[PDB]
Symmetry: D3
Subunit: 250 residues, 6 copies
C-alpha cells in the first residue's frame, strides 16, 4: 500500500483523477455498480474502495465514514494517489418546511460546525463547493427531473447535540447549540449533514475540486413515520445524480 | 424618504427588485448609462442612487461606499424598499501570479476579514454567493469573452493592514495579519476586496440573492506600474458584465 | 495626488497637523465655514476634504464616510500627509434614559463592535481616546454651556442588528446581539455610533491623538417624534464644540 | 434496532453496562475473543459490535471508527442502551523521546484539538478521564509488567495537519498548527490520537465514566522504521490491558 | 532573597521539594503545626511561608492568596527554589445536591474560568491534576474515613459573577455567565474554587506535579445557616488529609 | 462582618464613599498615615483595611492583593459597603525607553490580559478609567512636579509569561505571548501591571468610578540594576499623588 489507511497503491487507480465519496461503506458498491467494470480494490476500517469505468475513464468510489476526521484521511490519501475531484453523495436531514423527504440537496457552501476544517483553514475561510462541481450536480439533478434545492448546509461533527436533538441519553444540549437549529432555519440553511464542512474547506484551500449532494431522509420540521422504501428510493436517486455529475466532470 | 439613509421612497423604485451595488458613488451613473431611461433618484452621504430600465424592467444602481458598514446600511434599506437581488461590481487587487490586471473575478464565497458579516451570522456561516447570480455573472463574462477567474476572495475591513500592506504610516501590521497574504495565496484565494464578505453573508442568511464581480486593477504579486487607461477600461468591461448578468436575473 | 483615495497632496495641507473628521461628507463644509479662509481641496468617493485656518494655523476637515473601513482609509492617508491629531464629530443614538436628544456626548473609550480596529490591535487593546483631546472636548463643551455626558460608547459596524434594531427587513437579530442593548445599558454605555472604535484604536496604537464627540439625535429609550430643526440645531452645537476643541489642541 | 446507527436493541446487551471502544472495527473481534462466549451482534457502517462475558458479566465491544464524530454517535447510542462505562483502546504516535514504540500510554486528560467535544461542553471544560477507569487501566498495565506512561494526550480531528505532518499532498500546515507539536512536547504531552478528547469530554460532562489507553506504534521524535510484528504485538498487550481493566470496573 | 516576591532563599528550604499551598495566609501555620519542627520562614504581601518536617523530610507550606495571579507567582518562585510537587488545600462551595458541607472534594481536573492558566497553555489544554497526587489525596481521605467526592471543579477568577452570585452590588451577571452554574451542575461539576485551574494547568504543562483538595463550607443548592464550628472542623479535616497525602508523595 | 472576606461592617466606614486600593497590604498603613486620624479596621487574608480622614471626610484604604481575582473581591465588597470611587496606586514595569524608573504613570485604559474583567464585560468592552479620576490623578501629579506619563497599560494575570519574562523555571513563554512585549511597545503601551484591567473594567461597567496610578520601579528596555532606595522613594511620591487626587474627588 502506498498510503497509511486506504490500503491502495497508485497503480490500483489506473490514472483515475475523480472520486465519489459516500459516507457509508455499504453505499460504495451500489455507486460503482452503476458504472462499467466495477472492481473492489480494498476494505480497511471504514474505508471501502471500488474502481469503475465511466465513459471509458477510470473512476474511484471510496467511503469516508462518518465525520470530518475520517473524511480528511480519505481525501488526503486519495489526493496522494492522484485524485483531484471529489463528489460527496450522502444522506441528510432537512430543516426547512418547503423541502420534502426524497428531495435532493446540492450544497453551495457549509456552516462549519466541525473541527477538521479548522485544521486546513481558519474559521473565516468559506467551506464553499467548487463552481464546476456544483453546476454539474445541478445539471445532473435536472437531467432526471429530481426535485432539487440549492443552498447552504449546516455540517456538524455531531449527529445529536450539534443538530440540536434532545431525544438523547442526557436529554440536554450544550449552551452553544441551544436554539441553534431555529437560528439556522431563519438564515435559510437547508439541512444538517456531517462531512461537507470538512470536505469543502480542505479541498477549496488546497486546489482540489469538490461537490456535495445528499438525499433527504427526514425533515426535522415535519413529523412523519420514516419509510424505508422511500429512503432506499431516495439514495438511489442521489446516487444516479452524483454519477451523472461525475460524467460531466471527466 | 421611506428609509433612514438612502433618501428614497418605495415608489422611486417603480417595483424594482434587483439592484447593482458598486462601491464608488462615481461609478453609479456609468452603470445606469448602459441601460434605458436612466434617472438619478438621490444622493446622500456615500449613497448615490439611480434608476434605469433593463429589458423593460426597472433596475436600481446604488453605491455602497467603502466597507461592510455602509454596505450593510445600503443593502438593508434597499431590501426595505423591495430589492431582493444584489449584484456587486467593484475593483480588486489580485494575489495570484496567474491572474492579470484587466481580468474579471467572480466570487463564489469570501474569507470573512470584516466585522459586519458577524452582525448577521456567526463566523462559521459561509459568506457564499447565490448560485443563480454567480452563474449569471460567469455566463455574462463568457458572453463578451473576458478572461475570467472564479473562486474565493479575501474581503477585508481594511485597505492596508488587513491586506498586509507595509507601505504605510506606521509601517507595521498587527500580528494577526502578519504573513496573512502568503497564507491566503497558498489557499488559492484570488483577491482582496472590502465588501463581499458583508454583502454575501447578510444576503445569504436573510433570503436575499447576491452576486459578486470585480475587475483587477493591480496584482500584489506582480511589479508593474499602474495604468489609469487600462484601469478605466477594466472598470468598463466589469460594468458591462454586471449589467448583462442582471438581464439574466430579471 | 500623494495618496490612493483622498486625492490630496502634502502641499494641499500647508503643514496642517490636525484634522476634524465627520462621518458625513455634507458636514465638512459646515465645519470649515466656522473657520477662516475655508477652501475645498477635493472630493472623491465618500471623502470630501476642505482646508481652513484656525487662529492662524491651517486645519483639515475630512469626511470618513460611514464605518471603520472608510474611516481607516481616511485616517491612514491623512496621517501619510502629516496629520497627527484627529477629532471626530458625529451623530449618535443614546441608550440611557437620563441623556436627552440635543445633548453632546464625549467618548472616553469605545466598546469594539467593529472589525477594523482588529486590523490594528487585538480585541483586548482598549479603544480609548487621547487624554488631551478628551479634555479639550470637555472644556469646549463647557465653554458654551452645552449639556454634556462623558463616558463609554458602543461603536458598531452596523446601524441595524449591531444596534439591536428589529424594525428591519428580516426583523431578526443574530444571537450574538440579541439582548445586547440592554446589556450595554446596564454597563452604563451612553450611546451607539459607528466609527469611534476604529478611530480610537488605530490612533491609540499608532502614536496618533484622537478625540470623539457626537450630538444626540435620538434616544432609544425614549419614544419621541424626531425634530429636524432640533437635529440641525444639535449638529450645529457639536460642530462649534469640535472646532473650539481643535483650537485648544493647536 | 433501538438506535439509529448501531443496529442494536436493548436486549442484545443482556444488561451490559460497560463497553470497550476501539477505533478500528477490525480490532473488535480480537478484543472479544479474550473474553467468554463472544458473539457478534451487528455490523453497520464503521460500527461493529460484539458481546462477550467477563467474570460472568456481559460486556460490549464496539468500534467507534476514526474521529470524534463517529465516536460521539457510538457513545451516545450505547448509552441509550444502558452502557455507563467506556474504555477506549487504540493506537497512538508518541512525541516524547523517552517513550518507546511498544509502550502503553494511559491518558489522564486530553488537549482538545477536536470539534465534537465542543458539542458537549465549552473549550474551558477539561477532557479528563474518570479516576476509577484511569486507576484500573494503570493497575491492569502493572499487572502484566508493561512499560507504562501516564499523562496528557493531544487528541486531533486530523491525522495529518493537526498532528503537524508535512509529508502530505499540499505539504503545508495551517498557521494555527505550525510549530504546534514542539509546543505540546515542551508542555509534556505524551502523544497524538484522534478520539480521546471527544470521548472523555462527552462522558465527563454527562455522568458517564471513561478511560483511555493506547499502544505506541510510532514515535515522532525517533527515526526508526515501522514494524508490523511489534505493531501487532503492541496492539495485543494493549487489548489485554483494557480487558483486564474492565474486570476491575465490573 | 533569591526570588522577587516570597522573600526566601534556596537555603531556607533545606532541600525541600514538596510544598503545600493553601489560599489563605492564616492557614499556613495550622498546616505546619501538624508536622515536626515547624518554623516560619517569611511573610510578604499575601505570601506567608513556613517550613516543617514530615517523616524526616523538609516540607514547605506557602499561601498563594486568592486567585491564579498570586498563585502563579508563588508556584513559579517556589519552583525556582526547588519545589517540584504542589498540593493545594482550600475551601470550596459545592454545587451538587448530593455533596454536603463538611465533605472533602478531590479535583481530577478543572473548568478553566481563569485567565492565568492561559498564560501557560491555550484553553484546549486540560487543567488536570497529577495522577500520583490525586491518588495520594484519595487514599489519604480514605485513611481517616472522610466523606469524599472525586471529580471536576469549576475554578473562577471571580468569587461573585463567575460563580453566578446575584447577591451583589450590581445584582447583575455578565451574559457569558448567566445560567452558567446550572450548566456546570448538569455537567456533573462538583464545586467552585479560585486557584485550581491556574495551579493544575501551569504545573501539568511544566513538568511539575500538583494535587487539589478542598473542604466544603457551603452548598449552593442547599440553603442552611453557616456553622463556624463546622467550617473550622472541615478545614481541620482537609488539612489532616493534605498533610497525610504529602507523606505518600515524599 | 457585613461582607464575606474583608471583615468589615457598614459602620466601620463612617459613610466613606472613596477608597484607595494598593496591591500590597504593607502599603496600606503608609497611605493612611498621610491622612488624619488613621485607624486600622481589619486584616484578613491579603485584605488589610485602614480608615483615615481627608479634609474632614472619611476615606478608606484597602489592599487588593496581587491579581484581578482578589481585586474583584475587594472592590465588590467595598462597593457593598458604600464605596463608589476607587483609586489604585501600585508599582509597575515600564516598557518604553523614554520612561524612567521613578516616573509616575497614569492609566487612561488597559490592555486586558486578565480573566476577571471578562467576568464583568466581554473583551470588546474597554477597560477605561473614569475621566474625573484620571484628571484628578494628572493634576495631582502636576501639583508636586512629578515626571508623568499618561497612556495605555498592559494588565497581566501573570508576573512572568504574560509579561514575557524568560528568566524563569521553564524558561519558556506560551505561543500566545511570544513576542507580545515588542507588540505592546510598538503600540505605545507604557507599562505592565496586574490589576488595572480588572479594576477599570468592573468599575466602568457597574457605575463605579476608578483611577489608576503607579510608580516605575523597573524599565524592561533599560539594563540598570534595581535600587531599593529610589524604589521606596518612588512608592512615596506615588502614594502622595493618589492621596492628593482623592482630595479632588471628595
Ligand atoms: O449517509 P452519509 O453519507 O454517511 O451522510 C450522513 O449520514 C451520517 C449520519 O447518519 C453522516 O455521515 C451524515 O453526513
Ligand atoms: O471600487 P469598489 O467598488 O469600492 O471596491 C474596492 O475599492 C475599494 C478600495 O479601494 C473598496 O471598496 C474595494 O472593495
Ligand atoms: O453622522 P456620522 O458622523 O456619520 O455618525 C453617525 O451617523 C452614521 C449612522 O447614521 C454613522 O456614521 C454614525 O457613526
Ligand atoms: O487505532 P485507533 O483505535 O483507530 O486509534 C488511532 O488510529 C487512528 C489513526 O490511524 C485514529 O483512530 C487514532 O486515534
Ligand atoms: O480558602 P482558599 O484556600 O483561599 O480557597 C477558596 O477561598 C477563596 C474564596 O473565598 C478562594 O481562594 C477559593 O479558592
Ligand atoms: O505593587 P502592586 O500595587 O501590587 O502592583 C504591582 O505589584 C505586583 C507585581 O509585583 C502586582 O500587584 C502589580 O500590579
Ligand atoms: O438528521 C440527519 C439525518 C442524516 N444525517 C445527518 O447528519 N442528520
Ligand atoms: O489592492 C486593492 C485594490 C482595490 N481594492 C482593494 O480592496 N484592494
Ligand atoms: O441610532 C443611531 C443614530 C445615529 N447614528 C448611529 O450610529 N445610531
Ligand atoms: O501517528 C499517529 C499514529 C496513530 N494514531 C494517530 O492519531 N497518530
Ligand atoms: O462559594 C465559595 C466558597 C469558598 N470559595 C469559593 O471559591 N466559593
Ligand atoms: O515588572 C513589573 C514590576 C512591577 N509590577 C508588574 O506587574 N511588573
Ligand atoms: K463608507
Ligand atoms: K469515522
Ligand atoms: K491575591
Amino acid at each position: 500500500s502506498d498510503v497509511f489507511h486506504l490500503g491502495l497503491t497508485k497503480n490500483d487507480l489506473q490514472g483515475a483523477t475523480l472520486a465519489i465519496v459516500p459516507g457509508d461503506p455499504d453505499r460504495v458498491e451500489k455507486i460503482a455498480a452503476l458504472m462499467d467494470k466495477p472492481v473492489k480494490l480494498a476494505s480497511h476500517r471504514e474505508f471501502t474502495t471500488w474502481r469503475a469505468e465511466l465513459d471509458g475513464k477510470p473512476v474511484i468510489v471510496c467511503s469516508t465514514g462518518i465525520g470530518g476526521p475520517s473524511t480528511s484521511i480519505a481525501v488526503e490519501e486519495l489526493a496522494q494517489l492522484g485524485i483531484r475531484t471529489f463528489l460527496r453523495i450522502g444522506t441528510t436531514g432537512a430543516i426547512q418546511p418547503h423541502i420534502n423527504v426524497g428531495d435532493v440537496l446540492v450544497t453551495t457552501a457549509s456552516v462549519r460546525l466541525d473541527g477538521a476544517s479548522l485544521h486546513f483553514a481558519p474559521l473565516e475561510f468559506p467551506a464553499v463547493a467548487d463552481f464546476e462541481c456544483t453546476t454539474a450536480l445541478v445539471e445532473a439533478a435536472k437531467s432526471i427531473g429530481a426535485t432539487t434545492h440549492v443552498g447552504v448546509t449546516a455540517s456538524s461533527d455531531t449527529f445529536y447535540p450539534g443538530q440540536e436533538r434532545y431525544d438523547t441519553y442526557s436529554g440536554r444540549v450544550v449552551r452553544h447549540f441551544k436554539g441553534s437549529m431555529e437560528e439556522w432555519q431563519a438564515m435559510g440553511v437547508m439541512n444538517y449533514e456531517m462531512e461537507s464542512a470538512t470536505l469543502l474547506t480542505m479541498c477549496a484551500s488546497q486546489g482540489l475540486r469538490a461537490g456535495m449532494v445528499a438525499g433527504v431522509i427526514v425533515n426535522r420540521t415535519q413529523q412523519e413515520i420514516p419509510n424505508a422504501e422511500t429512503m432506499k428510493q431516495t439514495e438511489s436517486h442521489a446516487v444516479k445524480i452524483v454519477v451523472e455529475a461525475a460524467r460531466r466532470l471527466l
